[PDB]
Design a protein around this nucleic acid. Structure first.
Ligand SMILES: [Mg+2]
Ligand SMILES: [Zn+2]
Ligand SMILES: [Zn+2]
Lengths: 50, 471, 1334
RNA sequence: CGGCACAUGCGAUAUUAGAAUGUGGCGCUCCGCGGUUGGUGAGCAUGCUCGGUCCGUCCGAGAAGCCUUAAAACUGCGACGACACAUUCACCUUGAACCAAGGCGUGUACCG
């Protein structure tokens, strides 16, 4: 019941960098530049309610 | 956070540990300090002759070999006789060659053979503090002359010091600077008698110790700088070895005294260890100091950790009982009866009961009885020092009845019977005292007393007073 | 013996003056023999001898000496009570901060040096340095350092520099300060410069400074140099049985302090290094601070125990301190305690009491009489005679009882009827017999509760218990004039069975010559107890002046009524016994008998009622049985119909027609409808079920069911519990507070299955937990209310003022909730009130209104009466009796002296256990509209432009039957003054639509309305009238963000239509969602809408505490034209324009929230600017003291009358008086006080009336309401401010101030153990006050 | 407008691993012995004398001896108790322990 500490520091107390923390808690949207214009890879379920 | 143990740790955490050679270096600084204070003693002849008179008290069978000093540099009484006989020849050949620079090497040799003697700290610190008192009287006279002339008559301290510091003995500062006709020389003429008298008392202090304050000031500032060097070295070693006190005092924490109390008693023991440390035996500081720290801590826990202060050997007996009853409990199995402690130990088993009784800590008077209500133990303790009010009623009625009965007697019988006992007056009076009251015979008072009691034992007077004895 | 108690600081010279020894060694007693150790914490030469008049060695053992001291070992041979009295001291080596002046929240060393507390603790724990008047070279005075900065300052400035650390540094700071120089400095800073909140803190600090210099204190006394120690018999170490001791933990604390002080002296002898002595000074600081108040550090625990020990402030402060455990309430001798029981054979001036308790209590009385009568020669013989219980002592005990009242007491003694006196009748038994009618006063049932008896020893206490506290004196409550000796349960059942009538019985319709042959007919069995019968009775009346005029007649009554008529006294009319006589009727009977015949016939009449009630209840045989609960034949039919209807709603939800919430609401409404049909079935199946015959076919009547008599008589329970026994029981609520859609369709006469009973268990357990918690909170509320108001005593006979509040009836929306009569009955008039024909004096100016005067009020048509109230009295230090009223156990005016604050606070907090569209006019009369400003529209109706309109339904007798808070902009059908009929909806507003109605008639236009930015183009699907409607703040663009849409009017000519009567047009600004329906250039009429804007007990402890409401109603400061200022800050500037005064006031309003007024209107001071709850501070600061006391009494009487509990309003008014005693002065003038100083209103009032009687100018004040936990501590008498609440802050605030307490008001006099200046002791204090300084 | 910190109220009344050694001096120890001043509840229910007698017993006034004075106190001689100092051996080796987490309120300080 001690002082409020930020959460992710305990993840950084378990030998985790920012890369695999964001890998474990998030899914990756891939931006490819197919020759121009900075396109976006799409899974259609990602667009729900948007 | 406050938590003053942690503030102590952070206040001592800045001090770092010592290497195994820095302890020897600090010990050599301690040697330099005691060397310089003993060499400061070595110039002062009055301390020398004082210990010579104390040694004549040794030779007069009023003292002992273990009173004055202890030990020599290669303690025998024949050795004391021959070394102090060489000392005797040295100070009868030394002092009488002032008749200056011829005598100085003699005084230095007398000083060296004085330094060849290993003193008791009683006599040593007595000489030190006597030099301090002498210096304080000299400084009191100096500050007295300053407060007479400098602040009041507006004389500058530079013109004060000018012919004072440098001669300090004669009237070269005093009488010449009046004749030199300074604007401040006139203001001396109201204070010349007191300044001159303080100057002559300064000369008196010089004549007591033989040499001038020009030497004495350098003697005791040399003593002061040497002792300050020694005290800084000992401060540095204590600040280093606080860690040992902590590592020892981790063990005794739950024995009833607080943690910081333990480490402060350990620090007192550590300072005693730094006082009595000797590196030339070759042991580390730790092995020597650990016994002093544990001794001070154990003595303190035995001294001051109990409400009823029980002494040292009594607590040793209690700890023996707990140790042996810890050993026997895993030997027999149930718990030891004190009948087994009769043959287990050397005590007659009736004392073991009272040792077992004394070792109980008293209950807190706010220790809660059950159900955790406002009912604590303090609300149940009855007062047994009051008197019941019925006894006060008996005392009132008894005074009334005895007053009515003594009214029924004669004048002399009632007066004697009131005077003899504590009846409604001050202290009682005995036979010769009542005889000096009435100018009457001692035996006649006894006869009147027996006749009075014989008058009171008969009924119609004995009824109302026999009523105050219950069956 | 003495006068006023003074408190101050303790100099070390004062502490050495107290002490008779220095305690140099930490021992307590020697271990082997338990003589005290010299010179330890328990000493002889320091404190006193151990035994009475005896030295410790034994050289002086007797009364031969009392002045001597033994030269072997120091003992001043005296009484050993001296050891309870003499104190010691400890010479602390290094100084030490006092924890009370360091760690309490208004820290005194903190804001005395103007230094933050963390830096002060940083100095005291040797973590830093602080300069102590170190000259002016580089470093300021309060400028702290660190160690490296100290080395910096020392190498940069070797000399003329002074900075210590620790307690020495704080002591040098406090010693160095010259106070009056800084007094001049802060007076200059409060004259020229103005830094508002900081200068408020600054004037608080200058108040502390010129209060400190006015005292006799020095600041460096806040650091302890010599610490006093307490006498040994207050921290005793006494033998228990068994050779083991009990020490108090103060012995541990003083042992630790003495130990560390000796250690620090030993370290400074040996010239320790600095780390060690700084450790030891911190440890000595911790030891002293743990001794003075343990718990403001790391809570230093004791030895061989995990439990934290008990320090000095633990022994003063709290539930177990001396203020609340051993001074305000003491355990008392001459008391007893046993189980109570009934014994109905008593008159109510007497109670039973056991012979064994009467022998044990009255032992010294028996001793006295036996040694007087000579049966015991001495007193020890008297002890053995009463020990053996010989037969001669019982006549002696019957002599000593005969006229000696005892006090009976039940443990929750909430109101003042909990302690009453009685005369004992001795009982063969071990249980106190307690008179039955008295028990409703005690809230004592006989289910095992046990009571306590106390004995008045002295003669004055016997006369007090007979004259004031005998049970026959208290037959009226102090909460109201209702009888508290109301007959409770068996007696009202015996009456309700006795006075009733069945249509056929024995002796039906015969004739009787009087009540005597009624009794001869009933007790012979010829005629029944109840049969309608013509009798001849003779009633007396008080027609002439106190004269008993007799009239005799044949009344048509019953037999049992005639039998009860013998018990009625002479004065009452016969109509008091001609009805059915339930509980309400018998309470009215006792009330009329007391208000006519005085006290004695009412007491003997209550005893005769109780006797005849118990006797004819025994003759009743009123017995409950299983056939007595008739189940309706229509029960299961209604339950089957409801079970089909829930299947209908179930099919309508499975068809997707409805949502869940409307389904839920429909199902709960139809189950409540089924429960109501079951209730109206079972009531008509109980109450009229008895149908019998006389000289004809049939006839129905009220039933002789047992449970119907026990519910109709009001004996026990009402129709809710009868409903739960016969019909279905309710609709239970789950732990959510949600309520189950499937109710319990079974009563207790039928079985309950497992699930229904399991659901009911939750309601039962919630009820029990709530009763426990509400008991605790009601106790706390009573305690705060009495401790804010013990100081108030009726002291003067009359002040003679013209002040007063305006008693009106409290009708609101529905019918009468409390009429004019029972509000004003008991009070006194301020000015004379007049008939509706004016200049007709019906009462003169100040007469005590009693029941004939309220009869004279009701025979006329009066509606509002001005009444003297205690909150507006004129008296210094109390309330004059002629202003208070009359209500008490007696009926006359309040006597000079009697404490009314205590009885008021008890009568408020005692029922704390018991606590939890359009106009549809009901009644008929004429219409009245107050503060109305309206205009006729085109449709013949009337639209209202003023929202202060109050609707009053005034009948032909002038009084008000209904009132309606008229909303702004309603549609009146009738006008004003026209005779209206019942049911007629006169005003029909749209409650979902805020009106933007006008007074003008012309072409509506757009002004500052830009399309797409301030207004959007909507094209309607339903109506089809496309328009430009104002949008929200998110979508309006940066141009039209601050620019607001406005509506304005022209006529046909294009000229701006002015309001008929003024010159301002109607330019109105619309918020978001304000729908523009009528566009540019569209004609309207007078008042058409230019647009439309669509969409318990802790209450009492919030009111008297006067906490700030969550959403406050905002109120205008001064009356004037309202206007707007700047836009879009989150707030807006509300600007007021008074016509005569200086205008420039503006107030920040959070502009998201809906306002009330429009910009075109004008408000009065104290008028509402929005809605919601309002703080009492605003009502007091704007309207007046009469308005805020009316607000409190109306709100808390709503809270009490919701439960249906009567409390007279005097009590709430006098608590309101005790709230607002403090008042801050605005203009100082010729007075001594300050522009922001808070002083009590009575003290500034006696100052002004000395100055205003002279030619000088007075001091104008600002009255300031404080809550009950803050107006009770802000008091000029600190023991009443230290007895209950936060103790440490009060003692330190009164110790730095040198405050003097003049014992002033019953708390201190209970504390100090002398007479009370309210009751019988008022004459004593009046004689002393006449004697004192005259 | 957030954060950190602290204070404060209520949470019913009532009833239930030390071991060993020596020396020194001290006594606010009530422990044996001696010396010193110095008493008290015994003969005496009249041991003696005289007077009154209600009497041979009780009242009123006198003188003496024997015998109870180490009691009370004082001071020394033993015991004990507590205290100080000193010594010998063995072990020990540089930053601890700790509880408790479930309610409802009021308020203050600091920082952003
Ligand atoms: Mg009960
Ligand atoms: Zn003594
Ligand atoms: Zn008044």
């Amino acid at each position: 019941r001690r002082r409020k500490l930020p959460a992710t520091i305990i993840l950084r107390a378990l030998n985790y960098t920012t890369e695999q923390i964001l890998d474990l808690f998030f899914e990756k949207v891939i931006f490819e530049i197919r020759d121009n214009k900075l396109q976006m890879e799409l899974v259609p379920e990602r667009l729900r309610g948007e | 956070t406050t938590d003053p143990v942690r503030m102590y740790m952070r206040e001592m955490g800045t001090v770092e540990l010592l290497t195994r050679e820095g302890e020897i270096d600090i010990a050599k600084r301690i040697e330099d300090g005691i060397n310089q204070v003993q060499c400061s003693v070595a110039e002062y002849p009055e301390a020398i002759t004082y210990l010579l008179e104390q040694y004549d008290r040794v030779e007069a069978e009023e003292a002992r070999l273990s009173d004055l000093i202890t030990g020599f540099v290669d303690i025998d009484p024949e050795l004391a006789r021959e070394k102090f006989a060489e000392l005797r020849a040295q100070y009868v050949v030394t002092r009488d060659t002032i008749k200056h620079a011829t005598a100085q090497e003699e005084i230095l040799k007398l000083s060296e053979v004085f330094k060849q003697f290993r003193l008791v700290p009683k006599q040593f610190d007595y000489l030190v503090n006597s030099m301090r008192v002498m210096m304080d009287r000299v400084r009191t006279q100096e500050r007295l002359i300053m407060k007479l002339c400098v602040e009041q008559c507006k004389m500058p301290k530079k013109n004060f010091i000018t012919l004072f510091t440098g001669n300090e003995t004669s009237d070269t500062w005093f009488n010449a600077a009046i004749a030199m006709n300074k604007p401040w020389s006139e203001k001396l003429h109201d204070v010349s008698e007191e300044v001159h008298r303080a100057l002559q008392k300064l000369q008196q202090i010089e004549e007591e110790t033989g040499l001038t304050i020009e030497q004495v000031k350098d003697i005791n500032r040399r003593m002061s700088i040497g002792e300050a060097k020694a005290r800084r070295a000992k401060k540095e070693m204590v600040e280093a070895n606080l860690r040992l006190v902590i590592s020892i005092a981790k063990k005794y924490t739950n024995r009833g005294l607080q943690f910081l109390d333990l480490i402060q008693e350990g620090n007192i023991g550590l300072m005693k260890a730094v006082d009595k440390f000797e590196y030339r035996r070759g042991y580390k500081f730790s092995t020597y100091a650990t016994w002093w720290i544990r001794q001070a801590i154990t003595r303190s826990i035995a001294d001051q950790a109990r409400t009823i202060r029980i002494p040292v050997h009594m607590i040793e007996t209690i700890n023996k009982l707990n140790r042996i009853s810890r050993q026997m409990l895993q030997e027999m199995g149930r718990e030891p009866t004190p009948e087994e402690l009769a043959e287990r130990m050397l005590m007659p088993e009736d004392k073991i009961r009272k040792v077992l009784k004394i070792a109980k800590e008293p209950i807190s008077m706010e220790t809660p009885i059950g159900d955790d209500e406002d009912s604590h133990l303090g609300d149940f303790i009855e007062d047994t020092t009051l008197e019941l009010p019925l006894d006060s009623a008996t005392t009132e009625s008894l005074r009334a009845a005895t007053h009515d009965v003594l009214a029924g007697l004669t004048a002399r019988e009632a007066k004697v019977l009131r005077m003899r006992f504590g009846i409604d007056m001050n202290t009682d009076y005995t036979l010769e005292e009542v005889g000096k009251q009435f100018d009457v015979t001692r035996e006649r008072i006894r006869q009147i007393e027996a006749k009075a009691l014989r008058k009171l034992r008969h009924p119609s007077r004995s009824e109302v007073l026999r009523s105050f004895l219950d069956d | 013996e003495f006068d006023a108690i003074k408190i101050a600081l303790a100099s070390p010279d004062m502490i050495r003056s107290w002490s008779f020894g220095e305690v140099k060694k930490p021992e307590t007693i020697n271990y082997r023999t338990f003589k005290p150790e010299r010179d330890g914490l328990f000493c002889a030469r320091i404190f006193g001898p151990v035994k009475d008049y005896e030295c410790l060695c034994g050289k002086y053992k007797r009364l031969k000496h009392r002045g001597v001291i033994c030269e072997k070992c120091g003992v001043e041979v005296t009484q050993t009570k001296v050891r309870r009295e003499r104190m010691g001291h400890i010479e602390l080596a290094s100084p030490t901060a006092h924890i009370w002046f360091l760690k309490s929240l208004p820290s005194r060393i903190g804001l005395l040096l103007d230094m933050p507390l963390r830096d002060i603790e940083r100095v005291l724990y040797f973590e830093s340095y602080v300069v102590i008047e170190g000259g002016m070279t580089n470093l300021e005075r309060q400028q702290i350092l660190t160690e490296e900065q100290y080395l910096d300052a020392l190498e940069e400035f070797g000399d003329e520099f002074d900075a210590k650390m620790g307690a020495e540094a704080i002591q040098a700071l406090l010693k160095s300060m010259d106070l009056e120089q800084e007094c001049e400095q802060l007076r200059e800073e409060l004259n020229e410069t103005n830094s508002e909140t900081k200068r408020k803190k600054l004037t608080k600090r200058i108040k502390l400074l010129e209060a400190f210099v006015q005292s006799g204190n020095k600041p460096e006394w806040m650091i302890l140099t010599v610490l006093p120690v307490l006498p040994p018999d207050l921290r005793p170490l006494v033998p228990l049985d068994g050779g083991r001791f009990a020490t108090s933990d103060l012995n541990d604390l003083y042992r630790r302090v003495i130990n560390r002080n000796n250690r620090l002296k030993r370290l400074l002898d040996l010239a320790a290094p600095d780390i060690i002595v700084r450790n030891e000074k911190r440890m000595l600081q911790e030891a002293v601070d743990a001794l003075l108040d343990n718990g403001r550090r790391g809570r230093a625990i004791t030895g061989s125990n995990k439990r934290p020990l008990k320090s000095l402030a633990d022994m003063i402060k709290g539930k177990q301190g001396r203020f609340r455990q051993n001074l305000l309430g003491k355990r008392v001798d001459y008391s007893g305690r046993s189980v109570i029981t009934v014994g109905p054979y008593l008159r109510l001036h007497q109670c039973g009491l056991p012979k064994k308790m009467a022998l044990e209590l009255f032992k010294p009385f028996i001793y006295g009489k036996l040694e007087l009568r000579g049966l015991a020669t001495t007193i020890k013989a008297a002890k053995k005679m009463v020990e053996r219980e010989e037969a001669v002592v019982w006549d002696i005990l019957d002599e000593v009882i005969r006229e000696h009242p005892v006090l009976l007491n039940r443990a929750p003694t909430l109101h003042r009827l909990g302690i009453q006196a009685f005369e004992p009748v001795l009982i063969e038994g071990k249980a106190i017999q307690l008179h039955p009618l008295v028990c409703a006063a005690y809230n004592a049932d006989f289910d095992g509760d046990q009571m306590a008896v106390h004995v008045p020893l002295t003669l004055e206490a016997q006369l007090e218990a007979r004259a004031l506290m005998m049970s026959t004196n208290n037959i009226l409550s102090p909460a109201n004039g209702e009888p508290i000796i109301v007959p409770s349960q068996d007696v009202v059942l015996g009456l309700y069975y006795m006075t009733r009538d069945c249509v056929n019985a024995k002796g039906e319709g015969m004739v009787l010559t009087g009540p005597k042959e009624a009794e001869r007919l009933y007790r012979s069995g010829l005629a029944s107890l109840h049969a309608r019968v013509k009798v001849r009775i003779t009633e007396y009346e008080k027609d002439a002046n106190g004269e008993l005029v007799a009239k005799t007649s044949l009344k048509d009554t019953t037999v049992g009524r005639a039998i009860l008529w013998m018990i009625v006294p002479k004065g009452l009319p016969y109509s008091i016994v001609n009805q059915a006589l339930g509980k309400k009727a018998i309470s009215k009977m006792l009330n009329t008998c007391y208000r006519i015949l005085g006290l004695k016939p009412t007491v003997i009449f209550a005893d005769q009622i109780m006797y005849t009630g118990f006797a004819y209840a025994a003759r009743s045989g009123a017995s409950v049985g299983i056939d007595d609960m008739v189940i309706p034949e229509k029960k299961h039919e209604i339950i089957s119909e409801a079970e089909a209807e829930v299947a209908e709603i179930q099919e309508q939800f499975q068809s997707g027609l409805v949502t869940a919430g409307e389904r839920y609401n429909k199902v709960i409404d139809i189950w409540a409808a089924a429960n109501d049909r079951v209730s109206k079935a079972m009531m008509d199946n109980l109450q009229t079920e008895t149908v019998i015959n006389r000289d004809g076919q049939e006839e129905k009547q009220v039933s002789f069911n047992s449970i119907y008599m026990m519910a109709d008589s009001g004996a026990r329970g009402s129709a809710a519990q009868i409903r739960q026994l016969a019909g279905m029981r309710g609709l239970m609520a789950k732990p959510d507070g949600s309520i189950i859609e499937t109710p319990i369709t079974a009563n207790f006469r039928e079985g309950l299955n497992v699930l229904q009973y399991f659901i009911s268990t939750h309601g039962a357990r919630k009820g029990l937990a709530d009763t426990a918690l509400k008991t605790a909170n009601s106790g706390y509320l009573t305690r705060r209310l009495v401790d804010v108001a013990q100081d108030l005593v009726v002291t003067e006979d009359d002040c003679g003022t013209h002040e007063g509040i305006m008693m009106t009836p409290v009708i609101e929306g529905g019918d009468v909730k409390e009429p004019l009569r029972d509000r004003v009955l008991g009070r006194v008039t301020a000015e004379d009130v007049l008939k509706p024909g004016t200049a007709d004096i019906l009462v003169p100016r100040n007469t005590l209104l009693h029941e004939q005067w309220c009869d004279l009020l009701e025979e006329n048509s009066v509606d509002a009466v001005k009444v003297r109230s205690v909150v507006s009295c004129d008296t210094d230090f109390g309330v004059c009796a002629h202003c208070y009223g009359r209500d008490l156990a007696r009926g006359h005016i309040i006597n000079k002296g009697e404490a009314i604050g205590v009885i008021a606070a008890q009568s408020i907090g005692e029922p704390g256990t018991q606590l939890t569209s359009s106009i549809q006019v009901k009644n008929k009369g004429s219409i009245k509209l107050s503060n109305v400003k309206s205009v006729v529209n085109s449709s013949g109706k009337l639209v209202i432009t003023s929202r202060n309109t109050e609707l009053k339904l005034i009948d032909e007798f002038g009084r008000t039957k209904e009132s309606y808070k008229v909303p702004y902009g309603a549609v009146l059908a009738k006008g004003d003054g026209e005779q209206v009929a019942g049911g007629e909806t006169v005003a029909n507003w749209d409650p979902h639509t805020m009106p933007v109605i006008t007074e003008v008639s012309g072409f509506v236009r757009f002004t500052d309305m830009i399309d797409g930015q301030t207004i959007t183009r909507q094209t309607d699907e339903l109506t089809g009238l496309s328009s430009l409607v104002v949008l929200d703040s998110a979508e309006r663009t940066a141009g039209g963000k601050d620019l607001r849409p406005a509506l304005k009017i022209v006529d046909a000519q294009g000229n701006d239509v002015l309001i008929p009567g003024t010159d301002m047009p109607a330019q109105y600004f619309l918020p978001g969602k304000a729908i523009v329906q009528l566009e540019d250039g569209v004609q309207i009429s007078s008042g058409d809408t230019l647009a439309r804007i669509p969409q318990g007990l802790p209450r009492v402890a919030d009111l008297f505490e006067a906490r700030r409401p969550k959403e406050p109603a905002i109120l205008a400061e001064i009356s004037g034209i309202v206007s707007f200022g700047k836009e879009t800050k989150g707030k807006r500037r509300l600007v007021i324009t008074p016509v005569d005064g200086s205008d420039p006031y503006e107030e920040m309003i959070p502009k998201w929230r809906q306002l009330n007024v429009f910009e075109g209107e004008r408000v009065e001071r104290g008028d509402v600017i929005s809605d919601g709850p309002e703080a009492p501070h605003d009502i007091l600061r704007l309207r007046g003291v009469h308005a805020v006391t009316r607000y409190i009494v109306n709100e808390v009487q709503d809270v009490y009358r919701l439960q249906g509990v009567k409390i007279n309003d005097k009590h709430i008014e006098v608590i309101v008086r005790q709230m607002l005693r403090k008042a801050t002065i605005v203009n100082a003038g010729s007075s001594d006080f300050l522009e922001g100083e808070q002083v009590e209103y009575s003290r500034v009032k006696i100052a002004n009336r000395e100055l205003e009687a002279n030619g000088k100018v007075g001091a104008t004040y600002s009255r300031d309401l404080l809550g009950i936990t803050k107006a009770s501590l802000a008091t000029e008498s600190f023991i009443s401010a230290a007895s209950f609440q936060e103790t440490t802050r009060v003692l330190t605030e009164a110790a730095v101030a040198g405050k003097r307490d003049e014992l002033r008001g019953l708390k201190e006099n209970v504390i100090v153990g002398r007479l009370i200046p309210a009751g019988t002791g008022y004459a004593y204090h009046q004689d002393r006050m006449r004697r004192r300084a005259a």
